[PDB]
Ligand binder design. Structure first.
Ligand SMILES: O=N[O-]
Ligand SMILES: O=N[O-]
Ligand SMILES: O=N[O-]
Ligand SMILES: [Cu+2]
Ligand SMILES: [Cu+2]
Ligand SMILES: [Cu+2]
Lengths: 333, 333, 333
């Protein structure tokens, strides 16, 4: 087909955990969906102690923004590497077919840009990440990863073929960082990326993250940046991990319908407490809130959650249901 | 509904790996099922070397006992923290909805008790664990976790909707411990829980368990405490891991029907060799024994099994089937 | 039945990643399928640095060869331990039922052989591995493992019950090695297996592989030993990991149909980006190539892939499809 005959629609991305506006059920035929991202190398403070790293980002955030299209749309990405950056970058879409997911076609030095197009032939949530030959895990584990959602044209379906429609969506990107340590255990700091590279490699080879965070930092999805919902609302939480396994859990809730490995032609798993998202994958969980209050959303390696950073909060408004749960006798001597 | 109009039934729990008597198919309407557990902080010897830790238990065991109810029963738990203990505790049920699984409503100092009720709205096996704010992974990885089984009212079903009925059930709780080590690698010992806390946190942050055990100790499910079955018997093995992934395997057998992430509205996976139970989850495997003899039941990271403790035995009685397996020529020069 | 009345067929095995000739749909009734393997202890160079270990192999390779039979065939294995070896060995088939998978019946000292027969009652891909009592993880993590495929008699089926027929098959065995290190981090070398055993145990107990490789060495499945396919070809990739989780990914492709835990009575997962194969399991992924060029096949812990060795290549011939992917604007200032 002549792609030039198709509609074009430009998306304006938003910072995670929010997601750009879209339609669950496609209201048009196939489109070329136009995205732009600008790579930004920047310093980021990732914990309460003030540890500062040299992060590598798509669009200034860890994770990069969630892109949303429908099955058999074309994704057309303008990828910009400004001359204020110092490294070579590219992009690999797990949603795409060919050329190492696009990485072989999108190598951009500082001061260059490129435009890639691919057909989104499979529905699901997928990781995208930078992948420069020879330096792949360093870029990924410096924050250079995000996700793309390819919705079925008729939206999501349950295990029986009935519609599932979310009221809200959030994107939680989980990042393992490997901050080099000296013998005594304190983090080391580096003057340039080249001077850091060997100790970055050493640190990665321990297979032991120093930090595991949501939305780029310890506590990022707490306090005034907690996730929010109301009792009765249907929420989809997209979760990605580009490099290492995770096991999400909503403390006080469930995954009512979960695609743990993220691919919508498969029936969802029902009533999950915890789900495994393998490293290199995006997954999605659908839940209808039934109680108000604070929930924690965690990686249920609780060490990873509460000691290394992989924990966020929901604040949920509405009525308490004492049939579902109540304190019969409050704590007392 | 007025819960006060429902039948009440008191359960008397038993020590793992055994399970209190119950009905697979519900013989009554919905009930309030009454449980009591008493928290016990105690010293436990966990390996053959004599390493002794300060364990934190529900009902004196690691894991805590398996609770069994049916879908849409109410679970009413009296949780007692005697004044002989020294720490604050609570309980989070992954089966429950709201208040951080019950943890926000069940904080008990030594000398206090509380009673929680929740509706068991989803069928499956689920983890429960202590979760005191700020100290969650330390309590969990000190042994303070167990599981609850919420059976469908019409019992278990295979992938075709046909009944599956077990003859025996066992509960295997798998515990990762993080015993602090000095520089030379020997375990450190501590005078009080507060003096131990920072090195406990340090030890956990390595993400490398020193011990991974079934039923609280190396070898606990061997010798006179081996699991038992007969050829032809249908056995359900419930397995939980509150904090870290595991991959159970019956050496010499299979999981004929497995709910690896534990939730019975989903069809089981058939004919598994090994299954992944993510940290924070309970799973269940159904097997019909076909050969007698010794079987090993293991986490199939074989280092975790045979060097760190995650191995137990079945002793199975009955006839040998030479059609299924035989030595044609015994080992010989 | 009198097994002596059944046809016998002798298989001549081939070195991974290739697979001996077989039929997907069984062209005969049930057979006794005869295999022979000779154990070989040998030195192997496993990385580009020249690190040499004392490997323990079935048939001289890491992994051991893929065996292929059909459901309800009998597997009859002659296992030979020549007197040029120094250790005791045996074999455990995860496909088999009884006697610890055969290990209790196949203990062979150097200079001995044995013949085991078992009925392959369950279809799927399964691990096999050595398992000498007391020394199990050392033999497995020295390379002594492979896989067996038990095909359904009517071949593979998709999620709808329609045939899936592969044009090519490859077997990727992934091996975690634990090469002991001194305090400074250099590999230690040993004079005899007994002198190595305690430091091998110490190294394993860190749960941190020094090397994670495909087909026995860093780079083994690259260059002149890259995997090959053509656009339009249907390829099945069998992947096993006898001891540790992995998460395969075809960079630039997908798993169109995946049995992540390897058992063919279950419907496959569709359109996977990445899949989790738990330690102790074999899995299988089916893909139809749609684009030519180089693909990387990796464990998508990218540190494990690109820094520790768990990466191979496909070279795919044929036409480029610009509808599926194209560079709209090549990288430029
Ligand atoms: O479910 N809470 O750790
Ligand atoms: O299956 N045994 O390690
Ligand atoms: O998908 N590549 O790392
Ligand atoms: Cu980059
Ligand atoms: Cu506690
Ligand atoms: Cu061996």
């Amino acid at each position: 087909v002549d792609i030039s005959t198709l509609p074009r629609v430009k998306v304006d991305l938003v910072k995670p955990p929010f997601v750009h506006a879209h339609d669950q059920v496609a209201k048009t035929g196939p489109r070329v969906v136009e995205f732009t991202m600008t790579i930004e190398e920047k310093k980021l403070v990732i914990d309460r102690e003030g540890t500062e790293i040299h992060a590598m980002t798509f669009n200034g955030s860890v994770p990069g923004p969630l892109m949303v299209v429908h099955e058999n749309d074309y994704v057309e990405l303008r990828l910009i590497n400004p001359d204020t950056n110092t490294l070579l970058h590219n992009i690999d879409f797990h949603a795409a077919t060919g050329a190492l997911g696009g990485g072989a076609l999108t190598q951009v030095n500082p001061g260059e840009e490129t435009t890639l197009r691919f057909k989104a032939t499979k529905p699901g949530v997928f990781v995208y990440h930078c992948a420069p030959e020879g330096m792949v895990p360093w870029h990924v584990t410096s924050g250079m990863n995000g996700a793309i959602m390819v919705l079925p044209r008729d939206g999501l379906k349950d295990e029986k073929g009935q519609p599932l429609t979310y009221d809200k969506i959030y994107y939680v990107g989980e990042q393992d960082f490997y901050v080099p340590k000296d013998e005594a255990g304190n983090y080391k700091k580096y003057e340039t990326p080249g001077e850091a590279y060997e100790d970055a490699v050493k640190a990665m080879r321990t297979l032991t993250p120093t930090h595991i965070v949501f939305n780029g930092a310890v506590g990022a999805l707490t306090g005034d940046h907690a996730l929010t919902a109301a009792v009765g609302e249907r929420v989809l939480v997209v979760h990605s991990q580009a490099n290492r396994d995770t096991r999400p859990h909503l403390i006080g809730g469930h995954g009512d319908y979960v695609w743990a490995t993220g691919k919508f032609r498969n029936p969802p798993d029902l009533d999950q407490e915890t789900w495994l998202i393998p490293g290199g994958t995006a997954g999605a969980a659908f839940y209808t809130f039934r109680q108000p209050g604070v929930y924690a959303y965690v990686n249920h390696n609780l060490i990873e959650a509460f000691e290394l950073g992989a924990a966020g909060h929901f604040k949920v408004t509405g009525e308490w249901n004492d049939d579902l749960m109540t304190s019969v006798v409050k704590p007392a001597s």
